[PDB]
Amino acid sequence: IRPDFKFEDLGVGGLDKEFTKIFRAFASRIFPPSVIEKLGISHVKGLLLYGPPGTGKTLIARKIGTMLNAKEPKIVNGPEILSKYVGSSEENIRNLFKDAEAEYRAKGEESSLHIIIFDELDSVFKQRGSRGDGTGVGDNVVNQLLAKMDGVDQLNNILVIGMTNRKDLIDSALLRPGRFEVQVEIHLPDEKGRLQIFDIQTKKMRENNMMSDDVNLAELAALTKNFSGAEIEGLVKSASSFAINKTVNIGKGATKLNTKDIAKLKVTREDFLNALNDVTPAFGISEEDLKTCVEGGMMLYSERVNSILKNGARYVRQVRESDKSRLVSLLIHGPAGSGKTALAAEIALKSGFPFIRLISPNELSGMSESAKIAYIDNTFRDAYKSPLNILVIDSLETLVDWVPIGPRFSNNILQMLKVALKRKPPQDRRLLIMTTTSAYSVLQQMDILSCFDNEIAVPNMTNLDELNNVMIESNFLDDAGRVKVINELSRSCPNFNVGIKKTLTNIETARHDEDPVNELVELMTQSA
C-alpha cells in the first residue's frame, strides 16, 4: 500500500464506514508474514460488493487500483468469458490465474498480491443447481472457477471482487466460508454524504468562479431528500444546460453567440430549481403525499383546533421522551366532512420525526384481497426500522369494506389490523399510530374498541362568528359585504351546523356565480 496517501484524497463521499469495514480485507497483509502463521489465521480470498443500481460501486472498483500498490487489478466483464468453441470458454477462466500462480510457485510467500475483479458477475454464474437442459456450458464454466477457487493448492495471493446489482441470482454454492466470505451492502447516502457528493461534484465548478455566490449548497442538499449520486450529477448537468441555453438560442434563428456574455456565463439558483423540476428519482416514496392532503391549509378558526394540536404535541413529546412507552395508539372521530385527515397530517408534519408514512384506500385501489394483505404487512414491517416512527391509518371503515345491507365486509383485513395494532415493536423502537374514522357506532359494535389508548372528538363548527373568521380568511368579498351577509344570516337561520369542507365549496361556487347573499346564503340554508 502506498505511503503517499490518505483516505480523504478521493471522490467517494458518504461511504466512509464501508471503507473502514472493507479495509478492516487488507489488514491481514500489512504485517510481515511471520506473525500470521504463528497466529494461525488464514486470509480472506473472496469479496462481494452489492447495492441498488446507481450507488457508485463502479467508481470504487475503478479507483481502488491507485491505492493498491504494485501494478493493476485485471478487469473483465461477464459475457466475454463465454466463447464460441467447445472447451474454449472452459479454458478462458483457467487462463487468468496463470501469471500469479507461476510467480507464487516460484517465489513462495514473497509473491506480490494479485487482484482480479469480475464486473457484473451475475452474467454467467447462475445456480449450477438449475435446469433447462440446453448445452451444459453454463455449468462447466462455474465448475472451473470453483476448482481453481477452493482447491487453490496454496495459492494465497489472490483476491476476487464481485460486482452486482442483484445478489439473489448467484449460486448459493459461491456463498460459503472460504469462498466469497464477506458481502458488503452499499445503500443510498445520508444527508451528510449527500453534501459531500455535492462537494466533490461541484468542486471544479466552485474554483474557477463559474458559480454565482448566491448558491448555498446546504439548502439544495436539504431539498434533495431522495437522490442517488448518479442523480446528483444529472441535476448538475441539467442546471448547466439551462445556464448555457440563455446565450445560444437553439432553433429560432441561427447560432447567435454573444461572444462577450460567454466570459460572464454564470449559473444561478433558479436554474437549479428548474433542474430539480426536470429530474425525478426512482426512490419512489414521494412522501409529498402528506402535503397534498393538507393543501387546503389550516386557518385556526377556533380554539378547539388549538387545544387538539397542543394535545398532539403532548403525545409526540411523550413518546419521544419515555423509554417504557414504546407503543401508543390514538383514535380520531367526528361527523363526516368535519375535516379530520388534515388535522392528523398537520400533527404528523409538525412532528418532524425521521420516518413517516400514510395508508389510504387510494394506493390500495385495484388489488385483490391477498395483495392488500401483503401490502399492509410489508409497510408495517418497513415501519419497524428507524428508532422513532409516525404512522397514520385513514378511514378504517373504507379499508374494511363496510356496507350496511348485509352487513357485508371482509373479515380478514379487520383481523390483520386488530392483531397488528397490539404488537410492540422490536427492542428499543418506539411507534406512534394515529387512526381516523367517522362512524363510531360501528366501531363500538363489532367490539374492537379495546385496542385504542385514547380518543379525540372533533365537533364541526356551528357559530356564525367562526363563519366570519373563515370567510375573512378566504377574502370572499369586501368588508361591508362580509358584515351584511352575517347580519342577514343571523336572522335568516340562527341555528347552524354544516362542517368545513362544504363551506369552502359554497364560498367558491357563490364567488363564481353571484357573490351577493342570494346564492351563498341560499346554499348554506339548503345544506343546513
Binding site for ligand ADP (CB under 6 A): 11-13, 53-59, 165, 197, 200, 229-230, 233
CA distance 202 to 426: 42
Count other C-beta atoms under 10 Å from residue 82's C-beta: 15
- Using CB under 6 A as the binding rule, whether residue 340 contacts ligand ATP is answered as yes
CA distance 229 to 236: 11
- Using CB under 8 A as the binding rule, whether residue 87 contacts other proteins is answered as yes
Give the helix ranges, DSSP H, for 110-156. Answer: 137-150
Residue 37's nearest CA partner among 114, 108, 115, 98 is 108
Nearer to ligand ADP, 54 or 481 (CB): 54
- The DSSP annotation for 349-402 comes to HHH--SEEEEE-HHHHTT--HHHHHHHHHHHHHHHTSSSEEEEEE--HHHHTT-
Name the minimum Å distance from CB 437 to ligand ATP: 9
Residues of the binding site:
51-58, 334-341
User: Are 111 and 103 within 8 A, CB to CB?
Assistant: yes
The count of C-alpha atoms lying within 13 angstroms of the C-alpha of 66, restricted to the half-sphere facing its C-beta, is: 11
Nearer to ligand ADP, 57 or 114 (CB): 57
- Using CB under 8 A as the binding rule, whether residue 245 contacts other proteins is answered as yes
- Using CB under 6 A as the binding rule, whether residue 313 contacts ligand ATP is answered as no
Which of the choices other proteins, ligand ADP, ligand ATP, none does residue 423 contact, using the CB cut-off of 5 to 8 A by kind? none
Backbone angles phi, psi at 220, to 5 degrees: -60, -45
Residue sitting closest to ligand ATP (CB): 296
CA distance 121 to 142: 11
Which of the choices ligand ADP, other proteins, ligand ATP, none does residue 56 contact, using the CB cut-off of 5 to 8 A by kind? ligand ADP
Considering only the stretches 32-40, 52-60, 174-182, 433-441, report the one whose residues sit in contact with other proteins under the rule CB under 8 A.
52-60
Name the minimum Å distance from CB 55 to ligand ADP: 5
Nearer to ligand ADP, 74 or 203 (CB): 203
Residue 205's nearest CA partner among 180, 252, 165, 237 is 237
CA distance 35 to 391: 55
- The DSSP annotation for 63-94 comes to HHHHHS-SS--EEEEGGGS--SSTTHHHHHHH
Which of the choices ligand ADP, other proteins, ligand ATP, none does residue 340 contact, using the CB cut-off of 5 to 8 A by kind? ligand ATP
Q: Which of residues 151-190 bind other proteins (CB under 8 A)?
A: 165-166, 169
Task: Out of 501, 511, 517, 528, point to the residue binding ligand ATP (CB under 6 A).
Answer: 501
Nearer to ligand ATP, 46 or 339 (CB): 339
- Using CB under 8 A as the binding rule, whether residue 264 contacts other proteins is answered as no
Which of the choices ligand ATP, ligand ADP, other proteins, none does residue 197 contact, using the CB cut-off of 5 to 8 A by kind? ligand ADP
Name the minimum Å distance from CB 261 to ligand ATP: 35
DSSP state of 268: -
Which of the choices ligand ATP, ligand ADP, other proteins, none does residue 336 contact, using the CB cut-off of 5 to 8 A by kind? ligand ATP
Task: Out of 16, 18, 199, 233, point to the residue binding other proteins (CB under 8 A).
Answer: 233
Count other C-beta atoms under 10 Å from residue 239's C-beta: 26
- Using CB under 6 A as the binding rule, whether residue 299 contacts ligand ATP is answered as yes
CA distance 47 to 185: 11
The count of C-alpha atoms lying within 13 angstroms of the C-alpha of 188, restricted to the half-sphere facing its C-beta, is: 12
Instruction: State the first-to-last Cα distance of the chain, in angstroms, to the nearest integer.
Output: 82
Task: Out of 6, 84, 310, 381, point to the residue binding other proteins (CB under 8 A).
Answer: 84
- Using CB under 6 A as the binding rule, whether residue 438 contacts ligand ATP is answered as yes
CA distance 489 to 528: 12
- Using CB under 6 A as the binding rule, whether residue 342 contacts ligand ATP is answered as yes
- Using CB under 6 A as the binding rule, whether residue 301 contacts ligand ATP is answered as yes
Name the minimum Å distance from CB 59 to ligand ATP: 37
Residues 6+ apart with CB under 8 A from 93: 81, 141, 144, 145, 148
Name residue, grid cell 371482509: 410
Nearer to other proteins, 274 or 487 (CB): 274
Nearer to ligand ATP, 484 or 501 (CB): 501
Nearer to other proteins, 53 or 387 (CB): 53
Which of the choices ligand ADP, ligand ATP, other proteins, none does residue 13 contact, using the CB cut-off of 5 to 8 A by kind? ligand ADP
Binding region for ligand ATP (CB under 6 A): 294, 296-299, 301, 305, 336-342, 438, 500-501
